Amino acid sequence: PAPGPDSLLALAFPSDPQVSPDGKQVAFVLAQIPRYRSGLWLSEGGAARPLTHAETGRGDSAPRWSPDGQNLAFVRSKAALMLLPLKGGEARRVTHFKNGVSGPQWSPDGRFIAFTTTRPAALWLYDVEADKLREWYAPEIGIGALSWWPDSRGVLIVQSEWQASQWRQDVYDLPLPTAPQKLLDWNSAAHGLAPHPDGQRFALIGRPAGKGNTEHAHLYLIENGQHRRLDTGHDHPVGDAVGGDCHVGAFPEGPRWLDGDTLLFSSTVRGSVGLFTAHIGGGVKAYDHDPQGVISAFTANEHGVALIRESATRFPEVELNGQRVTDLHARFPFPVREPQRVTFETELGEGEGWVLLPEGEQKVPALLNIHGGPHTDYGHGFTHEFQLMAARGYGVCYSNPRGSVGYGQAWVDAIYGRWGTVDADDLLNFFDRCLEAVPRLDAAKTAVMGGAYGGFMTNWITGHTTRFQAAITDRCISNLISFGGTSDIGLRFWDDELGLDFSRRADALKLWDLSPLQYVENVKTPTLIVHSVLDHRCPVEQAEQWYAALHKHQVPVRFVRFPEENHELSRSGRPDRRLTRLNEYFAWLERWL
Amino acid sequence: PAPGPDSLLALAFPSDPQVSPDGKQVAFVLAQIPRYRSGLWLSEGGAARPLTHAETGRGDSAPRWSPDGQNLAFVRSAKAALMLLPLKGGEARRVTHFKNGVSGPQWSPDGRFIAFTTTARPAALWLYDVEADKLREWYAPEIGIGALSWWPDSRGVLIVQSEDEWQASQWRQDVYDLPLPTAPQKLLDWNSAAHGLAPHPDGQRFALIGRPAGKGNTEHAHLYLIENGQHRRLDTGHDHPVGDAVGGDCHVGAFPEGPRWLDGDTLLFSSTVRGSVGLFTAHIGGGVKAYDHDPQGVISAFTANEHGVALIRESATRFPEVELNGQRVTDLHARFPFPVREPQRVTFETELGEGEGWVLLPEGEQKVPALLNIHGGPHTDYGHGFTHEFQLMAARGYGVCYSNPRGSVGYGQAWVDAIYGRWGTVDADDLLNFFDRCLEAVPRLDAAKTAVMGGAYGGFMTNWITGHTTRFQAAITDRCISNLISFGGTSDIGLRFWDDELGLDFSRRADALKLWDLSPLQYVENVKTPTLIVHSVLDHRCPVEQAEQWYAALHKHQVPVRFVRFPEENHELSRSGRPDRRLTRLNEYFAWLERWL
Amino acid sequence: APGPDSLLALAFPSDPQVSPDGKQVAFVLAQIPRYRSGLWLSEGGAARPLTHAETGRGDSAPRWSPDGQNLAFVRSAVKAALMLLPLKGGEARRVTHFKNGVSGPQWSPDGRFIAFTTTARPAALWLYDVEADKLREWYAPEIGIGALSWWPDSRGVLIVQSEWQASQWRQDVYDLPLPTAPQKLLDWNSAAHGLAPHPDGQRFALIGRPAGKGNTEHAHLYLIENGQHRRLDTGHDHPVGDAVGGDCHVGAFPEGPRWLDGDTLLFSSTVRGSVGLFTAHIGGGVKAYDHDPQGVISAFTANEHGVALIRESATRFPEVELNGQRVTDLHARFPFPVREPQRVTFETELGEGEGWVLLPEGEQKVPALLNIHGGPHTDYGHGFTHEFQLMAARGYGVCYSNPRGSVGYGQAWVDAIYGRWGTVDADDLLNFFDRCLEAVPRLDAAKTAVMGGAYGGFMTNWITGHTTRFQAAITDRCISNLISFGGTSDIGLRFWDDELGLDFSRRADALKLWDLSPLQYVENVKTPTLIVHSVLDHRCPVEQAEQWYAALHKHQVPVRFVRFPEENHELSRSGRPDRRLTRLNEYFAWLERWL
């Protein structure tokens, strides 16, 4: 009896590992079941123990240590702000808003908790010594990243309509109430504010105004409006950009100053995510970077570090100062298997990918999976779907073609303005090496699949070769012109990824020549189409055009239209979308392979 | 301005003071505000602090210490789930998931089990295996389980239960040994009323509260030592009943009075003595000694072990407060929103000796109306319980005269027996004698602006009094009895109440005629006093048919009458936390008094 | 063998309303599990449905417009809206939109108005202007309006209304003219209903009793002229209206007297277990009009051109008739054969009393069920009783009689029990039962039961408390304690005053009431008794059944207490037959256990 999609229901999902101010404790969130609900967990160095026990709603989330280490602020599910005394007693509710709260942050002196609540959410203030609430700042467009000054005089906030329309933000100083002034004319993307201990300088993640969105995000030190790059000599982006289907909840990666010179940050490097230290008077040193593993989240102070760590074969686990605190991989209900690396050659150097095989020695069908982004990475995140594919007798081939994010800026830039050229080549180059390097893969039973950008590429590949026996296109793009007018990022995505504006005649034709639907007449591969009905980032019209086209050519086609939006497990704890999606994946694969 | 019924909403109500096993802590319930909700509070010796924070439902109640002192079992309504709260960090976990909830949790002394009951007809005894986090039905009784107590070795439970529904109707019960399940035998053939089982530390003998089979319900409840089915009385030389039987309108929630063995010879218990309730020590090889007995105060509840005692204490002048080993742990009297006043003792003479009562007067030197309040029971006591209603009556300019006539419970068995078979003779004499003494001893009382009032039996007596004299200018009868024959057939204690209180069976011809001659309705034609009638529509103990008969009779005679029919049953404040019934009753009381006095 | 559900085969007729030209009848029929009612119509042939309710209680109160072209009626779907149905084509229109609905519509004889009442404390009299399609409140009464009748010239209405007089259940008659920018007509100070205005527009007739008489007095017809009153149904020692038992009456049953001409007034009267139509005469006595002494006319409408009625017998289910021609086929729906009763007589110091025995098929011995009718001033006899037919169909001999206190055998027969319930009435019943066992050898004297409702429950309790001869007893809506009844029942102060001359609120009277209470003698009861009572009964509070149950239980007599959440007559109130089926189920279950 081979395992099925229901194997997912055995898993509990860790998230938001928050280290205590003294560095000797970690509080985190864990989502468990059919519906997933989350509660707070706590460990002092040993096996974690539950702190709350939610029975209804989504559960409890966003644990935030009070500076004295005695209380945990958290959010309870619409979303009320709670105060849990850690040395005895149940939590008290301190907010009573109709639509709840989001993103609580203690002030370093423990005198305040900042948060937002609901056109754009306004920043509020909970006076702890007064048990009183107070609206702090109601923004015009909205507030992004927020961080208290280390002396608790106020908060740094990132916020922008003309500049807001260009997805460009600045940084403002907002003092405690007794109007916010501007600190940095940034006119670009900025998050991850990390105030320096000196209370004057601060660091941010993002890009200066000159760069575009395809540019690697980096660390920048701000001083009197001046900015200089902090993570020098590191041609890799800041933050986790590696795939993995076992991330449910919040995953903080905000940089933290370990000392006056050291700022710790995460970075994606060739399919891995590691921790590094940027230095004011120096370059960048590795801090905790297994090139075979992924650190998905981390908190830190001068006394300790907490994180979530995983690998291609290890389910995410919570760690406190190197000591693993959870036993979540033990819950995985079938043996996990180790991938084998397969390389392919490019004019930019060596590309890499992996093959995950089932047990035995018999020939098995070969599944080419294409990751989305396109500027993310496959590699060393834990993928339950890939493990389950192998456990059901499929060879999973997955790679990082040009356009992936972890192999340098040039690797990303190679596909700029020409989706469907070198990226499609790299993928079929990689797949050909997989069949050569692994004789066990059945070259007569092949499939191609991917989501989002992987759906675009699945559509593009099926429209330029018939070699595959099945295809599964998920959250696909078929018509880049309509996407520009229908998607909620349509005007900036093609502008950033391709330098094309669908509302200009010459650009629209180039977009049409990049559209997989132009070449749909060549599609002969039986395709399963998976899409959400209410998708705002990739409207369902993209999947409708592909379905109608294959159906008009009478290519074997199936169209699953989900009423639940994407990431529904994270949004409601309901795993129905993932189980049905995997059910349809395997059903389609069993029919044609 | 003058205080009104709303003064009640200033008060928070304590209940269930549970001492920790090591004797250094007290966990208790406090119900506070419009609806009252209860949460768990805890103290180690200083000012109590809240442990839970109920926002919906009735709240949290029934705190039970785990023997290791690390956890609190309790019941949550937000219906009635069993919860476990780790006391040194973390929120509570729910361990039962029954549709109708649970009731009465009790840890096993080894901390290995939690016993409780839950329904689905009579509630079945269930078992929570703590080390296993598993549930299991233990014993589903035929009729029902009353008192329950673990053996000190946690080998099983003693239970009180009846043989059939006939024996249950007559309040006859036995005691059964029920061992822990693996895949109940009788311990004592009692055939009488029994509760408050207190197993002896030796794991073989045990004590019980109640009466032997021969005696009736009017006999004082006493302590009995059980040994191999043999029984001997334990609280010898103490002509007073066990437990609190003193009036007081500030008890909302559970009030434990279960006797506790301090050592192998000493058993600690509560007892009512002339309007007060104190703690005493029963002794196997001795008599009865006082332990904590202020003759001016009432100890309404207590827990105890070999390491400490927690209790709730009040007086006629002090709102209930929680105590731990002599140290008051709450500050609830401070919330009382107007000054309280000191009662004056007034005595009256009987062929059995001297009876006593009290007068509570308002401020000033002016003449004031005199309110004769009659306590129910009839075998209970006025005196040294805190009565918010009496304090508010005086604060609104009324003189409150309230006494303990013959039939009251705290002045010996003979005082109780004086009224047997003849309600409306010496009890009514004592009450009007006492009232005449009040007007004599306190000239401030206006003999021309007087009223008579009482509840249950006090309603019975109010009807009897107004039907045999015209002296009062107003009357308020609450939960009254008017027709003793119909009461026998309609009330859920009618099948034995008149049998024990009067030796009369309404279902026998000659007895019913005597019952009719003892019914105030026979003499209703003499009533001329403007009467306010207060009653719940769905009262099971005193069906509203009793109040309907009085109202209809007064109405045909056109005696000024008003009939308030409450949709909420009695003790609704304890049942749902809603104080509407209590405020409405007080509003109607004072409104009626302002019209006629 | 048939069961209680045999009732669900039946449809129930009511309110037979003749058209003004006398050639048509519109009526209500309640059919199926819930009963809903619709309007039916016949011109002389088989009746046909006019409406088709699927929700609510249905449509009711059909009333002809004077021109014969429209039917006003009341619709429950919507509590009770007044509807207008054009009879020659088209669906009905709703003209009232009140939250609590309307009640008792009456056209004015000129067709210009429809009077009715509707609530908001007492219901106010309203007016629908037909030519204007406008509504208008007419008269908001202080206490309430009882009977109402338009003057024949449509100038206004006579109303019966009374707090001092209202508390004594005494009413007068008022003239109320139509509004433009009410005076009293008769100082009656007594019970009056059934106003029948004379064609001359000045005099009118009433049903009731003058102030001197009490309620146990036979109701009679009285002619009113300028405040003077004289009895109209002279030489007829029987009351006006139907007072005979029968369990197949669902809905309104009009019996309002009607002037056939200037001298003739048609009325109904109960006579020795029957209900017939008679004619009273201004210049004469009383003549029979349609009086089968073996049948019951439960309702009737009439004018100068025709008569419609409902007729039944001990062996014939109720049927609608128009001028002698039966227009319904409802007896055909009765799902098992009906059987013919036997008359059995008993002797009284007042003369001959009568009763009946209904036996099952065969020749074998059968148990004998003594059934006691309530009232006490009603009659058993010639109404259709589905329960009695079903009892026989299940192998029981049903013995039922009219003892002294019954209403149809003269005023003296009624007055014999005054102030002494449980003497001559209980004697007559057991006298009757002894004659039944003698006259009918098939009755098993060793398997007997006694049962009855209301007053029949009082008597069942009284009898079981003074004899043990019966093997089972079923007491339904019983009275056990006459003292508490006086204070709990919504008629407690007027019932014992009228029936016994006793006021429970006076000491000497209460003792006499206690001596009349079956509970005083409960110690003697040894008969296994089933107790049936409604929990929310206002006329007979449940405390009466609780006292009996507790008493039998304390003596450990075999006892069973069915407490109904539905009040009495729930079938008529909601169309739900659950109470009737449950009650019959419990009856037969108890009888099978002990007989």
Q: Are residues B393 and B585 in contact, defined by beta-carbon separation less than 8 angstroms?
A: no
3-state secondary structure of A135: strand
Determine the Cα–Cα distance for residues C43 and A351; give it in Å rounded to an integer.
Answer: 98
Among residues A238, A239, A149, A151, the alpha carbon closest in space to that of A202 is found at A149
* Residues followed by a gap in chain B, C→N > 2.5 Å: 33, 78, 120, 183
Helix (H) or strand (E) holding C41: strand C36-42
Pairing of strands C443-453, C472-476: parallel
B359 and B442 in contact (C-beta within 8 Å)?
A: yes
How many CB atoms are located within 10 Å of the residue C343 CB?
11
Which residue type does C238 have?
A: H
Contact C325, C16 (CB under 8 A): no
Contact call for B507 and C549, based on CB within 8 A? no
Q: What share of chain B is helix, strand, coil (3-state, %, to 5)?
A: 20, 35, 45
* Residue (of C83, C515, C29, C486) closest to C250 by Cα position: C29
A158 phi and psi angles, rounded to 5 deg? -105, 125
CATH superfamily label, B344-596: Alpha/Beta hydrolase fold, catalytic domain (3.40.50.1820)
In whole angstroms, what separates CA B144 from the centre of its chain?
A: 21
Three-state SS annotation for A74-111: EEECCCEEEEEECCCCCCEECCCCCCCCEEEEECCCCC
Q: Which two tokens stand for residue B229?
A: 């089915």
HEC per residue, B485-541:
HHHHHHCCCCCCHHHHHHCCCCCCHHHHHHHHHCCHHHHHHHCCCCEEEEEECCCCC
Cis previous bond, B378, omega within 30 = yes
Helix boundaries (H) for A400-539: 409-413, 422-437, 453-462, 480-486, 490-498, 505-513
Nearest to B89 among A87, A92, A93 (CB): A87
Measuring CA to CA, which residue among A194, A157, A154, A187 is closest to residue A172?
A: A157
Phi-psi region of A468 (alpha: psi -120 to 50; beta: other; left: phi over 0): beta
- Sequence length of chain B is 597
Dmax over CA atoms of chain B, in Å, equals: 76
Q: How deeply is A66 buried, as exposed, middle or buried, from its count of CB atoms within 10 A (0-12, 13-18, 19+)? A: buried
Q: Answer whether B51's CB lies under 8 Å from B44's CB.
A: no
Sequence-distant (6+) residues with CB within 8 A of C457 are C374, C475, C476, C477, C478, C479
Nearest by CB to C550, from B483, B495, B522: name it: B495
What's the CA gap between C138 and B310, in Å, rounded? 72
Residue among C481, C555, C556 minimizing CB distance to B486: C481
> What is the DSSP pairing of strand A441-451 with strand A364-370?
parallel
Chain A residues within an 8 Å CB radius of B89? 42, 51, 86-88
- What is the C-alpha to C-alpha distance for residues C352 and C75, in angstroms, rounded to an integer? 48
Q: How many Å lie between the alpha carbon of B461 and the closest alpha carbon of chain C?
A: 18
Identify residue C15 by its one-letter amino acid code: D
Element (H, E) at A420: none
- Per-residue tokens: C61: 């109160």
What is the DSSP track for A182-214?
EEEEEEE-EEEEEE-TTSS-EEEEE--TTS-TT
Residue A592 phi/psi, 5° resolution?
Answer: -110, -15
Dihedral over alpha carbons B480, C565, C549, C456 (to 10 degrees): 110
Distance CA C100, CA C120 (A): 7
d(CA C310, CA A393): 84
Specify whether the CB–CB gap between B285 and B236 falls below 8 A.
no
A89 touches chain B (CB under 8 A): yes
**Angstrom resolution of this structure:** 2.6
Distance of CA A96 to the CA centre of its chain: 31
Q: Which two tokens stand for residue C265?
A: 């007034």
- Separation CA C281–CA C300 (nearest Å): 19
Q: Which of B198, B242, B190 lies closest to B215 in space, CA to CA?
A: B190
- In 3D, which of C438, C429, C434, C443 has the Cα closest to residue C395? C443
- For residue B100 the two structure tokens come to 């109708």
3-state secondary structure of C303: coil
CA-based nearest residue in chain A for residue B49: A89
- Cβ–Cβ gap B91/A49 under 8 Å: no
Residues of A with CB below 8 A from B90's CB?
42, 49-52
Contact status, residue B193 vs residue B211, Cβ threshold 8 Å = yes
Structure letter (DSSP) for residue A121: P
Longest CA–CA span in chain C (Å) reads 77
Cβ of B55 within 8 Å of Cβ of A90? The answer is no
Chains A and C touch (3+ CB pairs under 8 A): no
Given strand A132-137, what is the order of strands in its sheet? A102-106, A112-117, A122-127, A132-137
Asked if residue B543 has a cis previous peptide bond (ω within 30° of 0), the answer is no
Tell me the two tokens of residue A440.
Answer: 């066990």
Of C442, C309, C296, C314, the residue nearest C369 (C-alpha): C442
Q: How far apart are CA B333 and CA B347, in angstroms?
A: 29
Q: What angle is formed at CA B76 by the lines to CA B72 and CA B77, rounded to 5 degrees?
A: 165
Paired residues of B370 in beta bridges: B399, B450
Q: Which helix (H) or strand (E) holds A228?
A: strand A226-229
Q: Are C187 and C172 within 8 A, CB to CB?
A: yes
End-to-end CA distance of chain C: 17
Cα-Cα-Cα-Cα torsion B389, B390, B392, B398, nearest 10 degrees, comes to: 130
Cβ–Cβ below 8 Å for B50 and A88: no
Residue A82 burial (C-beta neighbours within 10 Å; 0-12, 13-18, 19+): buried
CB A579 within 8 A of CB A5: yes
Residues 6+ apart with CB under 8 A from A572: A35, A58, A564
Pick the residue from chain B with its C-alpha nearest to C517: B509
Q: How far apart are CA C147 and CA C185, in angstroms?
A: 14
Exposed/middle/buried for A131, CB within 10 Å: 0-12, 13-18, 19+? exposed
Q: Name every residue whose Cβ is closer than 8 Å to that of residue A224 and which is 6 or more positions away in sequence.
A: none
Fold of C342-594: Rossmann fold (3.40.50)
3-state DSSP helix/strand/coil % of chain C, to nearest 5: 20, 35, 45
Chain Cα centroid distance, residue A149: 27
Q: Are C476 and C533 in contact (CB under 8 A)?
A: yes
**DSSP string for B120-143:** --PPEEEEEETTTTEEEEEE--SS
Q: Which residues of B touch C554 (CB under 8 A)?
A: 495, 505, 507
C286-290 and C274-281 strand pairing: antiparallel
Quick check: B381 and B409 in contact, CB under 8 A? yes
CB C496 within 8 A of CB C486: yes
Instruction: Report the C-alpha gap between C549 and B148 in whole angstroms.
Output: 33
Longest dimension (CA), chain A: 74
| Three-class DSSP labels, A160-176 | CCHHHHCCCEEEEEEEC
Looking only at the bridges linking them, the beta strands covering B321-324 and B327-328 are antiparallel
Report the alpha-carbon distance of residue B480 to residue B547 in Å, rounded.
Answer: 6
* DSSP summary character for residue C219: P
Contacts of B81 in chain A (CB under 8 A): none
For residue C296, give every residue at least 6 positions away whose Cβ sits within 8 Å of its Cβ, in sequence order, or none. C242, C244, C246, C274, C275, C311, C312, C313, C382, C383, C384
Paired with C65 in beta bridges are none
**Using alpha carbons only, what angle is made at residue A328 by residues A324 and A334, rounded to the nearest 5 degrees?**
135
* Residue B512 touches partner C, C-beta closer than 8 Å: yes
CB atoms < 10 A from the CB of C33, how many? 10
Nearest by CB: B553 against C487, C520, C548 = C487
Q: Mutate one of C481, C521, C563 to test the B interface: name it (highest B CB count within 10 A).
A: C481
> Where do we find the tokens 């909830």?
B101
- Backbone phi and psi for residue A589, each to the nearest 5 degrees, phi listed first: -65, -35
User: What is the distance between the alpha carbons of residues C390 and C371, in angstroms, rounded to a whole number?
Assistant: 14
Give dist(CA B354, CA B375) in Å, integer: 18
Cα three-residue angle B559-B560-B565, rounded to 5 degrees:
110
- Ranges assigned E (strand) in C377-497: 397-401, 443-453, 472-476
B53, B55, B89 member nearest A88 (Cβ): B89
